[PDB]
Structure formats: C-alpha cells, structure tokens
Amino acid sequence: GKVRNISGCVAVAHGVRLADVDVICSYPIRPYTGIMSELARMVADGELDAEFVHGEGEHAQLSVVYGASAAGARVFTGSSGVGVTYAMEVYSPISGERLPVQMAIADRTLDPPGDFGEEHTDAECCRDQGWIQGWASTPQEALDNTLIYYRVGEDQRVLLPQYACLDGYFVSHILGPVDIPDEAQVKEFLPPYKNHHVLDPRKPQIIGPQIEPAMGPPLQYQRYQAVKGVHKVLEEACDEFARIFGRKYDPYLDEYLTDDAEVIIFGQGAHMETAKAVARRLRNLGEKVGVARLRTFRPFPTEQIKERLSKFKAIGVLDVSANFGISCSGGVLLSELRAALYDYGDKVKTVGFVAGLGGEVVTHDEFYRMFQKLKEIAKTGKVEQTSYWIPFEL
Amino acid sequence: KVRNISGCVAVAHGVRLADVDVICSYPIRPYTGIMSELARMVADGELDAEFVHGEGEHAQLSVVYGASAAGARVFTGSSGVGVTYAMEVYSPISGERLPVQMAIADRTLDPPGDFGEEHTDAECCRDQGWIQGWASTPQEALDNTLIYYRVGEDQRVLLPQYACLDGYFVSHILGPVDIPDEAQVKEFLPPYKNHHVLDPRKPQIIGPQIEPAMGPPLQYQRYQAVKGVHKVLEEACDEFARIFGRKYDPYLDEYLTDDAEVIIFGQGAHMETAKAVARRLRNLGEKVGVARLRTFRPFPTEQIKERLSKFKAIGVLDVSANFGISCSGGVLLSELRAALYDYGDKVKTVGFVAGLGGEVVTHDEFYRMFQKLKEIAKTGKVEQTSYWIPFEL
Amino acid sequence: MLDRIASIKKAPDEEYYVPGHRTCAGCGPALTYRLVAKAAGPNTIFIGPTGCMYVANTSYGCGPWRVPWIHAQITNGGAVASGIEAAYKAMIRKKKTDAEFPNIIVMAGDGGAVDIGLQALSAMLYRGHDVLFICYDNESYANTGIQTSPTTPYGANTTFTPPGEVVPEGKKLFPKDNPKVIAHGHPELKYVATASIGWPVDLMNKVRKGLNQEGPAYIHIHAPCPKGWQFPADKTIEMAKLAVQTGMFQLYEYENGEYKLSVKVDKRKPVSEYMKLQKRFAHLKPEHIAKMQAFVDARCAEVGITVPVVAS
Amino acid sequence: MLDRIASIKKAPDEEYYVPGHRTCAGCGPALTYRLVAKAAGPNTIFIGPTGCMYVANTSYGCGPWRVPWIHAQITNGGAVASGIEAAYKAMIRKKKTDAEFPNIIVMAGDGGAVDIGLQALSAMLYRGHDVLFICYDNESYANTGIQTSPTTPYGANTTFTPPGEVVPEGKKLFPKDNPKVIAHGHPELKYVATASIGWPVDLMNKVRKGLNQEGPAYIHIHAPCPKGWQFPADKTIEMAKLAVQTGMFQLYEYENGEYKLSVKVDKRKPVSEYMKLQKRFAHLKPEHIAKMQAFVDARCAEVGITVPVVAS
Amino acid sequence: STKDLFAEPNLKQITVWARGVVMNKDARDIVVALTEAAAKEGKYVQAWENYVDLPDRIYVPVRAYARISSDPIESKYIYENETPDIVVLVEESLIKGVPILKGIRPGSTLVVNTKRSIDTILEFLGDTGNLAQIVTVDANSMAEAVMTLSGAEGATDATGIGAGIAAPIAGAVVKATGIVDVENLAAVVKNPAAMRRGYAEAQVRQLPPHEAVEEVSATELLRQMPFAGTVPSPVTENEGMVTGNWRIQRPIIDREACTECYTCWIYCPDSCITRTEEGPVFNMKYCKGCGLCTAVCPSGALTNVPELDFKD
Amino acid sequence: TKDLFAEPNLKQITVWARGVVMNKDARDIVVALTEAAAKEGKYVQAWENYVDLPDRIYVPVRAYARISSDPIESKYIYENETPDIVVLVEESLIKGVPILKGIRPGSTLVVNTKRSIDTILEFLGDTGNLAQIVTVDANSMAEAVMTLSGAEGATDATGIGAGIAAPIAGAVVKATGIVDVENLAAVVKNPAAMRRGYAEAQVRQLPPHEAVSATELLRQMPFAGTVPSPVTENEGMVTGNWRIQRPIIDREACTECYTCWIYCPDSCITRTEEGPVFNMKYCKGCGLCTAVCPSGALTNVPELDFKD
Ligand code: SF4
C-alpha cells in the first residue's frame, strides 16, 4: 500500500480503521491521545463507521469495550501511564471472560511526579492479567501488530485480549515511514470476530456467575491452556502476515548480528533499534556484539529463548522500567530471562541494565558502556553485581 | 494475653496498638472483618482515630495518601479486585515516600466472583515500590502490622507497606494470638515523622511536574530507599524479639533444612501445612525441609542465594495465577531461579502451582510435591518447569 | 411499546426470573428482580454489578435469569451497560447482526449506584445511551455482611457503623438522595422515578415506562432487606409499605421539575412506627428519633408531601 | 472567619500565587488560581488534581504556590482532600500537632470535578468534610491538547469532537451542569455557588464565604481558555464577561433551595455575539446557533434569569 | 498419600448445622463455647464458620466447625470437617434434604434441638450409619435464638458467647459425649442456667449396632465449568440452586377460602407460585417457607405449618 | 562515542516559534522540507519538541528536522544538539532564547521579520559559527495558521504549508538549497507564497569567523521532588522571554485604579505609592492589562523596540 511518513499514533489508527472496529472508547492522556484524535477524525470524516464512545475515564474505557465485546463487537481502546493502572481492575475480567479486547499502550512513566516520558513500567504491571502482550519498536510495526493481535486474539482457539504496546513519544510521536496496507489485504488476513458466548436474547446465556473455591482450579487452568496455545497461533499469523503484507516478522525474537556474537543485549521496543546501531558501529572496532529484541512479552517465550539465546557468553538485559524490589534488582526482563536460561546459569552470564528512566533517552554512549561491561564479564566470567542503573552506576 | 481470634481481629489490635490516626474503610470479603473490628474499636473508644467511610478502594488509598502527607499515621486495606481497583494510587504513595500500610487479605480476582484466596491480587503490586510480606498465622498478622510500621516509617526508608495474609485461612479461621501490651509497642514503635508534610507554617510543594531529564535521579533515589530496607528490617526483627519475645527471621522461615536434600519454597499459611508434611516425612527418614518466604518485597536475592544454594532440588509453591510468566509457574519460581541463577546447573528448581481459586493445598498434594522433588533429586532432570496441581501432578 | 399493566390479575404470567437462587427467604431485592424481569420481557439484557443480586443469584456457577445476563464490576455497571448499547447500535447499523435492539437493564445495588458506581452511572446519562439503570436499595452493602452505604439511613446499625459510647447512634451521617442527584444536570435524562416492591404493579409500570423512552432512564427501587434491617422474613412487604407510609421513602416520578407523587397518603405515620420493627434502629434514643423525624419532614416537604403526621 | 472584600482597593495586596509558571499568556485558570489564593490567605493547603493548573504551573520541578500544595490524581481530588482534613482533625484532637486547622481547597478542572473526579467529589460532600472544592471550568481536557469534557458546550470543536461530514456540529452532546448535580442529594452541603474571573471581587468573596462554612462547599468558576476556545490572549476577560451577558454562564449562590443571582444584568445578548469571537464555534451553522440559544434560554430560566434577549 | 501418614488419633471433630441469619450465631457460639472450654483443659482447639456458606441467607443451611485435640492440630487450614464425631442440629427440620451424617466416624453422636420425640426424628433420618447416639434437647423452651450484626466475617461478637440456644444445645452435647468438662463449658457461656437445663433435660438414646457401616476424600473434589464459566439461561427453573431444603415451615392453602386474588403470587420472591384455573399452585421443590405469601394473603386461606408435620 | 557514532552528512534544522499562535507553521516548516527531501531519496525525520508539549501561548517552542543520505541512526532523541539551520518564525525569539546554542560551522539563521539584518545582529551579539543570516517578510505573504488539528502526533486536516510556513521554508531553500524548490512547492498547500519567500528573501553572508554529569543530576534532585514554597517568585519558570510585545504605561493618563492589577494572570503588577509596577522578568505580554484599562494609559509595543 501507500508509504507515508506518520507517527505511531496515526499508524495505530490506520490499523484500527482497517480492522473495521465496531466500538471505540476514548479518553485523553499523553502520549497516546493522538490515536483517538485520528480515529475521531476518521469517524467524523466517514473513513470509519464505528461507535465513538467518550468514556469518562480509563477504568470506564475498558468497561465499555468489555460490554461491547460481550455483545459481539470488535473493540478498541488504549491508554498511557496512570491510565493503564487506573483500569487495572477490568483487565482480569476481560481475559477470564475470554473477550479478545485490544488495548493499545503508548508507554508513559507512572506518577509521581508528573512526567510525560516513557517507561515500560505501566504496561508491565499487567503481565499477570492473562493478556497477549508485545512492544513495537517502529511506527510501521505498531500498525502491523494491531492487525496481528486481533487475528491471534480473536482466534477461536485463543479468545484472549491483547496489549499492543509501543514506546511513548519515540514511537508514538516521532514521524516514521509506514506502509499502510489495503482493505483487501486486511480482509484476507483478519476474519470477523466470533466468540463462544454472546449477549443475545434469541440465545440467552449467563456470563460470569459467582463460583465456589471448588470451581477455582479448573477455570484458572482453562485459561492457562488458552495462554499456552497463543504461540502456535501467533506463528501461524506471522506467516500469514508475511504472505499478504510482504513483511515477515519473527513471533519471538528480532535478532541482529547474533550469529557469531559473543555478548548480546536483550530488551524490547524502540531503544533496541539504537542498540542495533551501536552494535553495528562496534563491529567496526572488532567487538563481536549482537542484539536480541523481544517481540512477544506475554506469553513469555521461555523455551524459544532457552534454545536461541543460550549460546552466548554474556547477556546484558535492558529494562526500560522501574520494577522496584524485584529479584536481582534489574527489571522484569532480567528476572524472566534468568528464569528461562536457568539450566545454563553457570555458562551463560547474565546482568541487567536499567536505563531510560522517566523517559530519558538511552544514548549510544550508554549502550557502548553496556557492551564494554558485557565484554569484561565474558572474559572473566565474573558478575560483580546483578544490575547496573544507568548512568549512576555505569 | 492469649486469645483465640481470627487474623482479621489480630490485625485490628495491631492497628489499635499502633495508635493509627486515620483509617479509611470499605467492605470486601475476606478483609471486611478488619474494618468491622476497627469500627467497633472507634465506637467503643478503644482507639481515637478518624474513621473515614471511603466510597471505594481507589478512594481508600487516596484518602490515606493525603492523610499521610499531612503527617498522620494511617491504615487501610482490601482484597481481590479491590486491590486492583486502587492500583493507580500505589505508586503515587510510594514515590511521595508516604509510609502507608495496606493490609491485604488475599482473594482471587474476577472472573467470575470467587471469595477463595489467591496471592495474585497482592502480587500485581510487586513493582509498585512497597514493603511486602505474607503472614502465615493470625499471630504473625498482628506482628507484621507492628514491624512494618516500624520499618516503613523509618526515616532511612519512608516507604508504604503491604501487610498480606492468606484469605480465609488466616483472616477468618481462629487461632491463638498473644496480644502485646501498650507498653511494649511504645518502646518499639516511634512516632511517624516524615521528611515532608503539608503545613502552612513550613509550606512545601509536594510532587511538581518533572521533565524526563529529572526522571532517572528520582527513580534511582527511590531505588536507593528500597535497597536500604533489608538492613532496617533486620534491626526491627531483632528489636521485636527483645521486646515481644518472638524471633522472626527477616527473610526466610526455615524448617528442617540443615540436612535437607530437597525443600519446598513458598509463602503464606499453606507453608505451615508444608512443615507438618515435612515432619511426617522425616519420621519416615526422608531428608526434606521447608523454607517460608517472609519478605516478598524488597526481594532478598542475595540472602536466598547464600542460604538456599545448598539443596539438590527446590520446589517452589505459587498460590497464584501469574499467566504467561517465564517457566509457566508463578512469580516466586521466576524470582527464585533468578536469585539462584549462578547455581542453575547444580540446584534443580521446579514450580508448583496450587491452591487456585482458594482451594486447599492439602497434605496429600504436598506429599506428591516432595515425591516429585525426590525423583528430580535422583535424576537431576526437570521434565517440565511447572506443575499445575492437581491436573499435572 | 410495552403497554401498561392494569392490575395484579392482569399482570403477565411469564417469569423471566425463575425459581432457584441463594437469596434470603423473603428477600426484597429478589422480588424486585422478579418484577423487573416480568415487566421487561424476553427481549432483555441484564447487567449485574457485584452485589447480592449478583452473588446470591449465581451461587454457585448457575443463575435464575431466563434472558441474557452478564457480570459487571460494582464500579462499572453504567459503563458496561454503555458498551452493549454501543455494540448493538453499531452491529445493527453496519449490518453485522439481524438481532433487534433489546431492553438493556442495569440492576445495581445502592453501593453500585450511589457510591462506587455513581461516576459510571452519571457518565452513561451524559452520553444518553438507550439504557434503563435500576438501583435496588436495601440501604447497605448487604453481600459483604451489611455495611453502611450512602443510602443507609441515619442512626442505622451496620458492621461499619456500630453503636458505641463514642458514636451512640452508630451512623452519624444522613443518607444521600441519589434520585435527586442525577435528576438534575443531565440533559439527556428522559425519566426519573422511585418505586417499591410494596406496589408491584406501580413498579412494573415504571420499568416499562422507562424502557419505552428512547434514551437513558433511572429508577430507584426500595427493596427491604430482612437480614440487614433485621426483621422477620415474612414482614418484607409490611416494611416496604410502612416505609412509604412514614415518609422514610417517597414514591414519585420526576418530569421536568415536577414531582409527580405515585401514591396517596392522607396522613403519614411517625418514623418510630417504622423503625421500632427493625433491630437496626434498636439502639436509638428518643432524641435520635426526633432527628430522624425532622429529616423526613424536610425530605417530604421537598417533594410536596404536606400531609400531617399522625400516630396510629 | 475571613472578612468580606468590598472592592479591588480593599483587596489584599499579598499574592500567594506568585509569578513564574508555564501557563498560557492570558490564561483564565491562572487568574482563577491567583484570585482564589489571594482570598484564601496563608493558612491554606491546595490540592491539585492532574490538569493544566497542575502541569502548566509545575513545569518543571517547581511551582508558584506560596502555601502548601500537593499533587493529586485527576480521579481522587476530593478523596485526597478528605484525608488531609481527616488527618488534621485527628492530629489536633490527639494533641500530636499544634497547628491550627487550615483552609483546604481543591483546584480541579472540569474533567477532575464533573467527569472522572465526580465520584470522589460527591463522596466528600456526603461525608461532609470541612473542604472547599473548586472547579475551574475551561470547558475541555486542556492539558492533553483540548479534548471534550462533560462541560464542553454543544457543537464545540475539540480533537475528540472534530466537525466533519458525519458529524457537522462536531460535538453532538450538550454539557453536564455539575453545580446542579451536586446541589441536591447531599445533606451536609453548606454552600454552592458559581463564579467568573470577569467579576474578581465576587469570586474572592464567594471563596471566602465557602471557607467560612463549617462543612463542605462547592464553587464552579468559569475560566475562559484562549488556547482551547481559540481567541486572542488579551480577550480572556472580555470573553468572561460576554459569557455571563449571553447566558452561556450564570452567576449565582444556591442556598436553601433557591438561586440568588449575584450580578444584575438588565437584558441579554444573543449567544452569537459570544460564539463569533472563538474559533471553536467557527464551523457552526445558524441552525446550530439556534439549538444553543434555546438550550441557554432553558438554562437561564432554571436559575431565574427572566430578562429579554436583545441584540447589540 | 496415606490417611495413616497424616493421621491425628487424638483429634475430635464437631459439625454444627443451623439456619442462616436466624440461627447462624448460635451455631458459631456452640463451637466457640466448646473450644474455649477445651482450651481451659489444656487442649489445642480451633473454631470457625463454613466460609462457603458465607454470606449466610435466611433459612439456608449453614455450618460451624470445631477441632479439639490433645496434640497440636496439623490440619488447621481446611474448609470443613471431613469426618465429624459430633453432628449438631440447631433447627429440627435439618433432618430433611440435608446430608448431616455424611462422613461421621463410628461412635458418633447426633444432637437435635426439638420438642418432638426421638422416635419421630429417627423416622426422618432413616439410615443412622456410624451413629452410636441420638440426642434431643428442647432448646427453644430454654433460651432464645440470638440475632446480631456483630461477630460476622471473623470479627469479635459484641453480644458475647452463648446467651441463647447455643448454651442448652452445648450442654446437651457434653452430657452425651463428654467432649469437654461441663463446668468448663459453664464458665464460657453468658447463659449457664440454660446450659445446665440442656445438660439435665436432654434425652439420649443409644442406637442398635451398625457393623456394616462403610469407611473418601470429600474436600479434594473439584467442579469444572463450561467455557469461561458461561452457562445457558434456564427456561423454567434453576436446578443449580434447589432451595426446598430451606423450609422450617410451608404454606398450606384452604382453597374454599381462597378468592384467587393472586396477591400471594405477585409477592413471592422465589417465583414458587403459578396461576391455574384451580387457583394458585405452590412449588415445594424451591419454596423456602419464607411466609410472605401467608403474610400477604388477605383471606387467610394460607397458613404456615412446621416442615416436620409432613411425611414429604 | 563522538567520533564512533558520528553522522557527518546528516543535517539538523531547528525551528523556533511561539506556542499556539505559530506552532502549526513551525511544524509545517520541518514537515514540508522533510517531505520534500524524501522526494529526493533522503532519509528524513520531522518532529515537534516533546518537552515543549503542551504548547502555551507565546512560549518558545521548537520543531526539528533531520536529513541524511544515510539511514538516520539517531532517530530516538528529543532535540537537535548541533543545528545547521536555525529558523525563527517570530522575530522576538532573538531575545532571551538560546537559539544559536550548539550551531555548527557554516550554519544559517533565518528570521521572519520586516526589520533589517543589521538590527537583528545587534540582539545576537557574537554569532560564532553562524556563516549566514537571512530575513524574510512572511507576515506579508501569508498568515499564521491556527488549529486544534494535527496535535500530539495526529494528522493535520488543514494541510501542509498553507500559511507563513511556505514563504519561510522558501527563504530556507534560497540560502541552503537543502531541497529542490519545486519539490517544496509540490508538498505545500500554498506554493504561491512559498515562491515569494524563495524570491524576496534577503541573504547576508557573515564575515569570516573561526570555528567554535548526570551523576550530578542525582545530587541535585531533592527528596521525592518536594520543593519549598517560593515567597516572591518562582525562578524555575522565568517567563519574560515569551513576549512578542510588552505593556507600556503613560503616567499622565494612569489613574492608579489598579484594574489591570487584579486581572493579570501572572501577578506581574504590584500596587505602589508611585503607581503600578510591571514585572518584566515574568510578563508574558498577553495584553490583558492593556485590554481592561479604563483610562487608555496602556499600549502594546513590539518587544524588539526595547533593547534592554
Ligand atoms: S442480605 Fe438482603 S439483599 Fe442480600 S439476599 Fe439477604 S435479604 Fe436479599
């Protein structure tokens, strides 16, 4: 389709428009606001026929699309920072009721104080809620993930809600080249939303009756199985997306120069692209470094990582978040990577880097200092401390 | 004075002994009894405090947020979807360094409605920057209430705390509790004095908008506060043993671990069941032990690494549904494996997910857990990282 | 349109709230749900915010509703009930369904309507969704063990408001009048009314009148709670009538500044004749009873109830 | 007890809202904050729900407040205020402080008072805390880039309500009247009034009257936004006075069930003379103007403004 | 695992059945009084209410448990007693439709609050299984069933322990089983006089030997739900919650007096009445015996009759 | 890190404008040129300064452009640190604003003004690495477009280059040739005005001139961000440089009614025995005081008329 220079916000909106979303619930909060402004324009200019509900808050947003998805509509909403945490109560009801709601998250640091800069902290708080979750690093990927997560989420084998996350400002605001696909391609890729339950007087159902503790484990295990079936469906989706849209995505890891790398940096989102840039410049010096960008955060590709990242001497995990008090005092990505690569704990050295706090840019120099540390660790096999907080400790 | 009381009432006496100045209530099973008792205490003049009827959990934390900023010692609590409804306020409380205590009587999140307990609700808040721990008995629910006010309100810390206790099993079921005297607490718990407060005589602007450049210094500042908690917690647990006569380990409640080959690692009331099963197995010759985590946040990475890296295999109980998490167990499995990572080839780890929806983690299930661990200890191979009981084990 | 019900004998035989629910014997709200369901008919979708009429009706893993029903949080009844309406309007307009536009009804308790659910309620009224929002008022958070709510009367006993030497009356606060709260400021609001299980025909008629509006409607139904208020299970209807006959609860319709009273009381009994039958007020002294009477007199005067107060 | 201010001459010289904030040139809410702080005095604690008067005033890591101020979530302004009042009443009683009881003021925007903050506000009024809750109304979600709120006028252009082929007027819905939403149903409510920056002395006297009340008070202040409404920065006071003169905003005190008009205006200008000066209405047709004129006439009659609408 | 491996040979189990709301406190008081009496004897005790029965409803069967052992209880964290040594019925009608004897161990005792003969009760039971003793005590003639809003959800009871029928019933348990010393039980109840009446006046019969009584794991059973726990709407009845066994009484109609006004029919909260050409028909499968139909019947055609008067 | 990650052939443009009233044209300038450079096969990136958001009326705001023949490896930043082209949509920005901070050898400053070049030079002082200064009268060729659309990343429904952005961008090309003038014309809504700017622009080449931690940041941040309440003023936000105009009082006309005093949103007026005193350190030149004065004692005067 037509290539245009657009922000990630507008890229998401085009993904929503092409998805022919039936109900959209809006509420403003920087830096995601632009997504709704663009959708409100499309509905006003007749580019998209959808119910544009002005939610009175983020908690209400997720509630509106909760009700709408149960009535059989394809829904869309989104938020940022405290807006994500404000609607926290509704996330679990949505997934446990198997409503494939999609929520876009342009990341923003949580209060306090006020800060419009991004952290992945806001979206990572929802990692237990039982949603599909991943980070887009480019405006192009933001559009693409929108279409992908709908297909995977609304898949009758899955029927789970999805978080389509993108870095605040860096992806959401900064204009980038995007290939906006055709409606014929999307209709070929995305089937109409059909659930196993719906609110319809002709076929009356009771959705969500109070249960006793004895009914606890089976229902919870029932959702557990739905989560573990996502990876298979995601793989089938990424192959379909490559065949229709011409862009081939890896469902788990976006690897760069890792074939003969001795140390790599692991993370997700926009800053990983800068890591690729620094890695390439460092190769010219002789340093054999690589980058592994996580494409799917939930459900965590534990095994895929175990067999693909266990061949490096050292792994530096970037956490653009403030996961306070966590094990090893890095971030969530570090803890879950170490958990995944537990068997090779003596051979593959791991350390965590915390940077990009409060939305601060993770500079090339900072990445260079990260790679130098990994170089030292790989040579000595000695990790003096499990985490480094940039730029105070490294 | 030893009485047979519920965990709810135990917490109330702890609050009462703390002379809390502001309380904000709201009803939700199974923590409701805590506020009911507190409501009666205020009505009977057993405690002088402002008992605010919050319109919801979000408001509860909000009321408690402002009162703490006004220099008052505060208390509130919730369960299940109540904990998640208030999610927006937690970080504001932590970042403004307000030592709010929130009691959590655990309960499964919707859907559907389930009054049974899971640790899932409190574990959603693990990133929020609070002091967090689980009491396994009504006696400890009271004790943790006093300890966390001491550690939390410490001027080296000034951090909010989650006083967690298993729903029903601790909160409702009656148990023997030694209620401390008003003299002991006065020696143990000093008055709440913060580094900032709302006072027209010393006017301060609390929480002004910051630019991204100011981001890293502030986040790192709170991080330095979180790291300094453990030391302060050691002092308080030593001081509690001296004044009250009960010795709590600030990190791990270990049982029969000296010569144990395999152990079960976890937190909460179900761990007390595990100890009983372990003792019965010891009576058969089995070298099994139990380590109960008393401090969930800040996670004791180094302490665990030194103390639990002496066992062949470690079974981690997760009484929660942390969907999609690495190794497909729960949070504790992921954070324990991260801590023992350097010993990942020697110390075998496996996850046990049970007690879902509030179901009992039985002696039988603990037996099957210990037996699975022995098989792992013999073979040194973990066929799968997690077992969802009883479906998979 | 759903036309008026002339009498008990001329009421519909059909039940869309069937036998089989763990509600208290003589449960006021249960009857409310039954009458509402009977009036609404089969083309209906119920939205049930967390509370007794959710938990007690569905315990365990079942339900009594013959029509579609979905669980909602106590915080988002109005928002959930905004989505289904938006969904049904979109799916119909975009020709993705052949279903007809259904009656969309919220059955929130007082807590989920006046306290923790007010914000979601008010916003739904603002957006003007074609939804009937019903509050069944048992004047407490009943399911959690009877706790004080903003509709809980003054001096009433709850586990959050027990009588002590510091608080002799138990609850010092006077109730919030939610029907009057939302009746103003919301331009899209079509119909505001109060109802009672004591007058079942009047109740069902108000439901149907509210459903016949092409816009938002709100009905505050008084439903006595034998457990919470502490009176015999077979005295539920007697309590409901005494509530109206003492001015403790007013029956009316509010149409553009006009309070249209639904029942004719020539003289209202004192509050003491209503409160003495419930153990929730059993602690109150005559000095407190007078304070209640003064509040009721002001409440009744506000809606134009000017009849004298005469003892039985 | 704060004394009445007779005039600009008798107004206090002291500024408790000092120069130095990233507020728009000619910012209506900025003047609101200055006037309110000037009237409030030194013994005052401000609560600032997220919004322009939080972000614009505190960028970056600074602030213009001479008295204590604390950030609040946009969702909980009233709740944060309740806690401060609860703390002070508790600390003073328990002799843990020697500080005198302060003025407690919430400076919330329309979103944080009428929309996403209504629940916390209403509950505060219900509990009857000694707090003055103030809403500065710029008729949008301003700090987020001007988005629609329940106080945004019908047919007003925002980034969430853009004019187009499908929706020519841009915003279909008519605004919510928050002062009338809270004025009824809340028994502890001592004082309700509307104010405008166009009448500064009247604004400061109303703020002081509310603070003198022993219970809660609510003041709704019209604060024109030159950015969002799209008019020149030197027209803000002109726009404030035209709003009252056209009936788009009505100045009154609501006490004991009747409106007391604060400003005496003999006639009334057509809303056209008010809307023509702001480009948020530039897309509207004369038929849209008529719908606005009719809505305003109904509004004015509701508060008792019965003057003729006379063109200039 | 093995029952031998986790055996507690010196642990006694007590299960008390009662009616919700009207008798749940006395149920609590029975197991609380006995554990407080056993604790005085230096034994390890645990008392609690069935959490799944919470919140109790009017007339729903609810349970309270006691665990008394001379050795430390290694099974504290459970929901129910799997193998009761003592089963207590606070209300007599609980011998119908309720599995009161499920799990009982050999040499067990059943204690019933009733005025009816032992033989009468044994005719309702049928299979007495592992029971060694059947005991009746007219506790209703000795004390009153206490009702309070306090002591709920784990909170302390402000009305004390054993002021009502809990005392005579507990006194009857001791005389039959000797579970604790009666003089210890006397020191822990507020009504020791009534307790001693129950101790003295209770009637104990030893049952004929049952040598063929069987010897499961009840609390290890799960219940699986459909997709997302969504269930189909019932057409006529909700068999997931059959409430017929709530009855302590039932409505009996005199059709020669019935005018078929169907006043009873419109007021039943549980939809147990159906209109027929023969008059109203009452559904005994679900009827809770609330008595509302009898209370609203103006002709006196309906009367409440004790459930044990029927051979149904 | 300086030499290693260098992108020598990359060009950086920094456009300064007044918030709300001109932020649209600023955005359009960097959008037009990048869209034009993209037509020439260049890797481009245009954006608004995020920390300047949300824009306030008259506050200095910025919009950036990055143009390289190679893929941009420095996309995810906030601002251009080393500008090659500095554009000023409003003339008063040469006063109290670090507009030339970090500029590189051969840099070009472009100013929308009717004033002469020599006058602009007086305010700048030492231009350092600046090699050329350009002036263009864009106010005569087009108007400053103002809208609620195209905000916070959203697309603009008013199009690109309809206002003074077209003649200004034309003045840029005339001096730098960073894009082809026809490509710029093909991406603007008002090419007619663009060509005027490209034609009528006056270019002077400056005389030969010689070429020109965050740990401490931790040490600076107070406990939880809490700051003491200021007594007289908030020096964290000095707003004097917002002025495109200032209020000037005539003491012969002033009646000292202090009507202006009560209506200033920024508390910049103080009542004195000698009359009202205006705080030019913070005054934003909003013009409210001038608009409310009963005596006509106040006048709004262009800021560059005052060389203080
Ligand atoms: S507590 Fe009240 S509302 Fe709830 S089931 Fe019982 S009678 Fe009905």
Ligand code: SF4
């Ligand atoms: S308004 Fe005009 S006349 Fe009055 S004090 Fe100000 S400058 Fe002087």
Ligand SMILES: [Mg+2]
């Ligand atoms: Mg209720």
